[PDB]
Design a protein around this ligand. Structure first.
Ligand SMILES: NC(=O)CC[C@H](NC[C@@]1(O)OC[C@@H](O)[C@@H](O)[C@@H]1O)C(=O)O
Length: 241
């Protein structure tokens, strides 16, 4: 009666974020939107779940995987990079996005990674950016923030020199706050975004993988990517055939 092993067989409960625009964010009415959200919804329709049967709940990034592991949500979707470390806690669907980690700075700020020595760099707790910075930015003071909004506020108030976040979100903040610019782009192609599910929920993982493959094959993935990330390169792996 519950082949997908959901908390409630009538609905899919998804954990996401309100401040990861354009991957996942809320409209002014509060409804979730963004690339990951519209992609998940299109995948869910293929699983037999209409938009009205999918509930989105925003949390701080660090709460998402533990919330899935503890059975608070059926899935998490928020540009969650697939890593061996994370696979110890949750299971992942096939990948659906591979891009860059970006250092966002002010108008007269840092111009390269070496320029980060002796600087204050914002990072969101639990992100791949925090891991990358601790491994490759020795000598940079890392300032932990619960979300991007608080970190960008600190950057704008001059209390951090830069913020480390996902490329598309850095690009969006650079448009909202025109003085801000992307100083450094770090590849993160080895940690493609995947939907996160409870370890062992093979039925749901298999179903999301099938829907993702179908969405990529019929050009839905491409359409959503062109809508939400205009100008960003799309790899053949996620495009038709
Ligand atoms: N919502 C967030 O804050 C996510 C931050 C960060 N995302 C990295 C990533 O998955 O973002 C989408 C793609 O660019 C991936 O290559 C990348 O590893 C992470 O997973 O930790």
């Amino acid at each position: 009666d519950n082949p997908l092993g959901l908390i409630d067989p009538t609905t899919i409960s998804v954990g996401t974020m309100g401040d990861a625009k354009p991957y996942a964010f809320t409209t002014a009415d509060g409804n979730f939107t963004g690339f990951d959200i519209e992609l998940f919804l299109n995948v869910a329709g293929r699983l037999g779940f209409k938009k009205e049967q999918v509930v989105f709940t925003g949390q701080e990034f660090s709460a998402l995987m533990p919330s899935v592991a503890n059975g608070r949500f059926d899935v998490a979707a928020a540009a969650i990079g697939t890593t061996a470390k994370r696979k110890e806690t949750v299971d992942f669907s096939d990948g659906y996005l591979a891009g860059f980690l970006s250092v966002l700075t002010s108008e007269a700020g840092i111009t390269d990674a070496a320029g980060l020595k002796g600087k204050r760099l914002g990072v969101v707790q639990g992100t791949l950016q925090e891991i990358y910075a601790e491994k490759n930015f020795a000598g940079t003071d890392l300032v932990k923030f619960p979300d991007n909004n608080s970190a960008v506020s600190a950057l704008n108030n001059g209390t951090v020199d830069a913020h480390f976040l996902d490329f598309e979100a850095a690009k969006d903040y650079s448009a909202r706050y025109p003085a801000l610019k992307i100083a450094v782009n770090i590849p993160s192609f080895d940690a493609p975004a995947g939907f996160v599910i409870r370890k062992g929920n093979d039925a749901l993982r298999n179903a999301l993988d099938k829907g993702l493959k179908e969405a990529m094959q019929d050009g839905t993935w491409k359409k959503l990517h062109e809508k939400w990330f205009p100008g960003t390169p799309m790899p053949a792996a996620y495009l038709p055939k």
